[PDB]
Amino acid sequence: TAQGLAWTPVGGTLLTIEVAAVPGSGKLSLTGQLGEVMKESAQAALTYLR
Amino acid sequence: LGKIARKGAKFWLEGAWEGLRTIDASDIPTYLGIPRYRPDKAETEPQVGTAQGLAWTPVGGTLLTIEVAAVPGSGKLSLTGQLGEVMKESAQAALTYLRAHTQDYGLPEDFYNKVDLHVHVPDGATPKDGPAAGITMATAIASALSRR
Amino acid sequence: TAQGLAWTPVGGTLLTIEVAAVPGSGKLSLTGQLGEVMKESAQAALTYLRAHTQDYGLPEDFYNKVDLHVHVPDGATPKDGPAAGITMATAIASALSRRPARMDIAMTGEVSLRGKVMPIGGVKEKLLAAHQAGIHKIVLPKDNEAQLE
Amino acid sequence: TAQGLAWTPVGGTLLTIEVAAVPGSGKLSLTGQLGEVMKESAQAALTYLR
């Protein structure tokens, strides 16, 4: 985990990042039912990692 | 307690055979109707499929038969019954650890795809905020997927 | 068809609970618009039905190819209480075989999602609610041991 | 047009309309002032589309 800071529409908080090292087939999902900008920010991260 | 008292009054009004009669267990269907439901399930028994969790419904702090079923299917989590998602994502958090611990607890190498999970929660919403018994269903999921 | 049973304030009779085993998308349908008594319990019964489908000749892709228009009459619950589970269980067991279920059997009960049949109440009105309407055969849950005591 | 005949309590009539043909989605809607048993029969008639 890192402690992600962001402006939720109810104010400020730390959206700390729980994250799983699940074996599988290489799929990426996300939760919170958030905007897709979250997903492609994750792909940007994952792109630098790869 | 009213019906108990009144049945005592009826059997006493036919004649006072004693100054003190004793009301005791299983002598209640002698005095009232059928045991209207089964008594407390503090014993139950090891059973494969689902769990029940500690919470507070707004009309009471009580358990909910959160059904989960280790059905062999296409691999999903079937919260059937329009259920609270906190059960959903807590269940993937559980099943996530289980996927990380599949070599630990006799689970198959793949079960996220090999079997579904037929989930049913008695309340459409959540009785208490947060998956107040997340580890309970986690345990049940592990037990059920372990075919135990 | 499994003629389920209800205790109604309009006459003691049987719920002609018909369930559709028709090829299609593979699903279950809302029929009496009830849900919390019939759809969830039918789903739970269907879970144990998904245990050992080929005991009964059931094509395993029924939820993949057979749509279920599963109809408890009186719309919603007539007894106001789950008393009619094993009913829809044996109904879909007969229907999904696409074979004639029997007749003159009006029945009761509540199955679980774990091959368990739970204990039920409201049974006196059901044992009554058969003899009002020309029936002398019901099915009862086993856990209700005190029900015939 | 179909002779869906329904006997009125007062007098007697042959219930029928002139019909369009404008298909597309399951919302044939009428403020027919229906009864409650006919209300639940209509709620059944919802899935009677299936």
Side-chain angles (χ1 to χ4, degrees):
Chain A
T1 302
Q3 289 69 241
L5 62 84
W7 202 249
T8 59
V10 293
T13 180
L14 309 193
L15 314 165
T16 76
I17 297 89
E18 43 171 358
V19 64
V22 289
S25 61
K27 182 265 293 178
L28 174 56
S29 67
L30 171 153
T31 51
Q33 295 283 323
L34 314 171
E36 200 82 6
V37 65
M38 296 299 103
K39 280 93 193 165
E40 61 260 11
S41 57
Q43 273 78 242
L46 208 48
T47 303
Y48 190 83
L49 276 296
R50 72 181 75 192
Chain B
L1 282 179
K3 270 168 65 169
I4 283 283
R6 270 79 162 182
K7 284 288 185 66
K10 177 178 79 167
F11 290 150
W12 193 94
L13 184 45
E14 301 171 348
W17 65 69
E18 196 60 33
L20 294 174
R21 197 180 307 126
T22 301
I23 303 185
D24 47 350
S26 79
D27 190 359
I28 298 89
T30 312
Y31 299 153
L32 295 175
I34 184 172
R36 205 180 298 104
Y37 215 80
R38 310 257 86 87
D40 292 331
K41 309 307 183 303
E43 59 295 335
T44 63
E45 86 294 344
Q47 172 43 247
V48 164
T50 187
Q52 64 183 357
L54 314 178
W56 180 72
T57 55
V59 290
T62 185
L63 279 149
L64 286 188
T65 67
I66 312 308
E67 286 102 345
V68 289
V71 64
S74 74
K76 65 179 72 66
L77 188 153
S78 308
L79 293 176
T80 316
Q82 318 296 338
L83 296 176
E85 291 325 282
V86 294
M87 283 73 74
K88 182 88 175 179
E89 75 254 8
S90 57
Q92 293 84 18
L95 191 61
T96 290
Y97 180 101
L98 277 296
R99 267 169 301 189
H101 300 74
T102 181
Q103 58 91 27
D104 288 325
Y105 310 127
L107 305 177
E109 321 313 312
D110 57 332
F111 49 81
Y112 54 91
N113 53 26
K114 199 165 76 171
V115 296
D116 303 337
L117 187 65
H118 281 175
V119 186
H120 325 261
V121 171
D123 296 347
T126 81
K128 277 199 93 162
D129 52 332
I135 66 170
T136 314
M137 65 184 74
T139 318
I141 286 164
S143 298
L145 294 175
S146 67
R147 264 143 185 153
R148 304 309 303 156
Chain C
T1 309
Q3 295 94 36
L5 279 168
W7 180 247
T8 66
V10 289
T13 189
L14 57 84
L15 299 179
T16 309
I17 297 165
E18 295 152 342
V19 298
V22 298
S25 70
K27 65 173 314 289
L28 187 153
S29 175
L30 271 290
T31 60
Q33 207 176 0
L34 169 50
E36 70 275 15
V37 175
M38 51 176 197
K39 309 309 169 161
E40 61 86 20
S41 303
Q43 187 65 40
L46 181 59
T47 64
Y48 182 66
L49 191 71
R50 292 191 58 173
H52 295 88
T53 62
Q54 302 293 156
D55 293 3
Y56 307 101
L58 305 179
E60 301 178 2
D61 61 342
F62 53 102
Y63 47 82
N64 304 116
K65 73 183 193 67
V66 172
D67 304 332
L68 263 67
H69 306 84
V70 289
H71 176 245
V72 175
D74 291 331
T77 180
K79 197 35 178 287
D80 168 351
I86 82 180
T87 62
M88 293 191 69
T90 182
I92 62 170
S94 295
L96 294 174
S97 66
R98 284 166 184 87
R99 304 301 286 177
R102 266 195 78 176
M103 182 277 288
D104 205 46
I105 295 91
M107 72 291 290
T108 74
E110 278 295 344
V111 74
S112 307
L113 83 162
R114 297 194 286 184
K116 163 169 164 45
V117 181
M118 187 66 204
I120 69 162
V123 184
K124 163 220 179 180
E125 274 322 315
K126 296 271 172 290
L127 306 184
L128 278 175
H131 261 289
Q132 278 103 30
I135 302 305
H136 73 92
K137 207 198 294 177
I138 298 169
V139 177
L140 187 69
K142 185 53 101 165
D143 296 338
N144 286 122
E145 191 276 336
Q147 183 73 239
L148 307 190
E149 295 294 328
Chain D
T1 302
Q3 290 296 106
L5 309 181
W7 176 261
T8 61
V10 298
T13 186
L14 298 191
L15 161 71
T16 177
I17 79 164
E18 65 88 19
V19 191
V22 184
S25 287
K27 185 178 184 293
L28 177 62
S29 59
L30 176 67
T31 54
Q33 314 181 351
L34 294 174
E36 179 50 48
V37 59
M38 294 182 286
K39 168 67 62 180
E40 59 86 20
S41 79
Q43 305 300 153
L46 268 297
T47 195
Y48 272 72
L49 276 72
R50 293 182 184 271

